Amino acid sequence: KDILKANKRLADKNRKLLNKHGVVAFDFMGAIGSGKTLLIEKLIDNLKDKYKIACIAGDVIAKFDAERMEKHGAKVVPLNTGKECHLDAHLVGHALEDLNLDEIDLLFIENVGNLICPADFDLGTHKRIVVISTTEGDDTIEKHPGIMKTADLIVINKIDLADAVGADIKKMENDAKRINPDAEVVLLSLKTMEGFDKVLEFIEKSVKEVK
């Protein structure tokens, strides 16, 4: 199989096109229901005064999250993935054709909920974000090191629920730091909004550092 080699070529092409039009793109990965959509929703709300934001929403049935993002004023391209367990640069490249990249500053891509397959499939983004939550259990990070090593930012979300599931958030934070020393690691609650400042900081730092 030559799958991963052909994907990378398309990812580099995606990145070059985005750079050509001054677009900074983020890949939002995570487990099922970790909080990817709600994070994106909050990011749109709090950055739209400064940036023109577009989204690509990928899932079995993309409409649910597409509709959520749209009500926040962002242009969304939905991608129904169906039986596929991941997105790829090929599909993302075609979604880009539906966007006016000259009228876009930021691109948020919500990947399929999956802590395994998306690790191998570069989409052509500048940064990769992995979102997990306390409610998945505090062994979630050490159980899935592969995807963690591909992240630029690891978000441990739903910290407000940690005690209710018996999750040690300090342990999780340390797991993340240890498995990927180069990543930023943020403890977040999208309910209380604690930690959100650090996610915004990551977005802004990323924009300034491009190329």
Does 90 count as an annotated binding residue? yes
Of residues 173 through 202, those in contact with its own copies by CB under 8 A are 191
Shortest distance (Å) from residue 144 CB to its own copies: 6
Residue 158 CA to residue 169 CA, distance in Å, equals 10
Q: Which of 110, 122, 136, 173 binds its own copies (CB under 8 A)?
A: 136
Provide the 10 A C-beta neighbour count for residue 141: 27
- Note whether 128 and 27 are within 8 A (CB): yes
Collapsing DSSP to helix, strand or coil, 11 comes out as helix
Q: Is 161 in the site for ligand GSP (CB under 6 A)?
A: yes
Q: 71 is written with which tokens?
A: 């009500």
User: Do 115 and 26 form a contact (C-beta atoms < 8 A)?
Assistant: no
DSSP alpha helices (H): ranges in 31-85? 36-47, 63-70
Nearer to Zn ion, 29 or 207 (CB): 29
Q: Is there binding between residue 158 and ligand GSP (CB under 6 A)? A: yes
Does 55 count as an annotated binding residue? Answer: no
**Binding of ligand GSP by 165 (CB under 6 A):** yes
Measured CA distances, 140 to 84, 123, 147, 162, 182 (Å): 22, 24, 11, 13, 19
Among 144, 153, 156, 203, binds its own copies (CB under 8 A): 144
Q: Residue numbers of the site for its own copies (CB under 8 A)? A: 31-33, 59-61, 64, 83-85, 112-117, 119-120, 133, 135-137, 139-140, 142-146, 158, 160-161, 164-165, 191
Q: Residue numbers of the site for ligand GSP (CB under 6 A)? A: 30, 32-38, 59, 65, 113, 137, 140, 143, 157-158, 160-161, 164-167, 189-191
